[PDB]
Amino acid sequence: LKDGQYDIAFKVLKDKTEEISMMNTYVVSPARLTVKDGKKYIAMTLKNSEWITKFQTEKNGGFADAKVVSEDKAANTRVVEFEANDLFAKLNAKVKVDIDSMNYHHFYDVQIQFDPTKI
Numbered sequence: 710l711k712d713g714q715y716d717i718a719f720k721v722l723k724d725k726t727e728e729i730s731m732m733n734t735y736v737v738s739p740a741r742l743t744v745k746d747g748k749k750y751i752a753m754t755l756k757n758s759e760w761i762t763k764f765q766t767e768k769n770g771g772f773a774d775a776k777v778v779s780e781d782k783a784a785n786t787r788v789v790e791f792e793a794n795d796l797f798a799k800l801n802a803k804v805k806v807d808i809d810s811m812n813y814h815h816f817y818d819v820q821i822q823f824d825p826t827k828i
């Protein structure tokens with residue numbers, strides 16, 4: 710594909726499975742793919758932002774916090790940005806969730822699967 714901005718559908722999968730993750734409820738698909746100089750960046754909206762305290766994706770054999778490129782405090786959402794390579798390969802990610810009022814404090818591994826062909 711060539712430089713520009715595109716819609717890309719995706720699903721978040723439970724770690725090491727083809728099952729839909731509980732996290733899938735809290736992301737917006739499609740995400741936005743920016744292609745720039747042969748590199749691919751994904752901008753993804755997280756819902757219930759206040760609950761999601763960390764979000765990381767695999768980068769160079771390690772995990773890195775995705776950049777927050779915008780926040781909407783009124784909507785309680787935010788947009789995070791990270792690099793993808795092969796849009797047909799699963800991307801490993803990590804999430805930390807904290808809901809003080811429900812005593813829910815966990816962190817998880819998940820996979821993101823993009824589907825470039827989907828509309």
Ligand code: HEM
Nearest residue numbers: 722723724729730731732735757760761804806817818819
């Ligand atoms: C808000 C109320 C929430 C409740 C009641 C809840 C409940 C649960 C429960 C019971 C499980 C065990 C597996 C299952 O039953 O499906 C689970 C796992 C999991 N939850 Fe939560 N959760 C909540 C919020 C969130 C949020 C905001 C995220 C954002 C990432 C999240 C991500 C996950 C992940 C990644 C797992 C591991 C299994 C999977 O990937 O589906 N959850 N959750």
Ligand SMILES: [Zn+2]
Nearest residue numbers: 814815816817
């Ligand atoms: Zn846990």
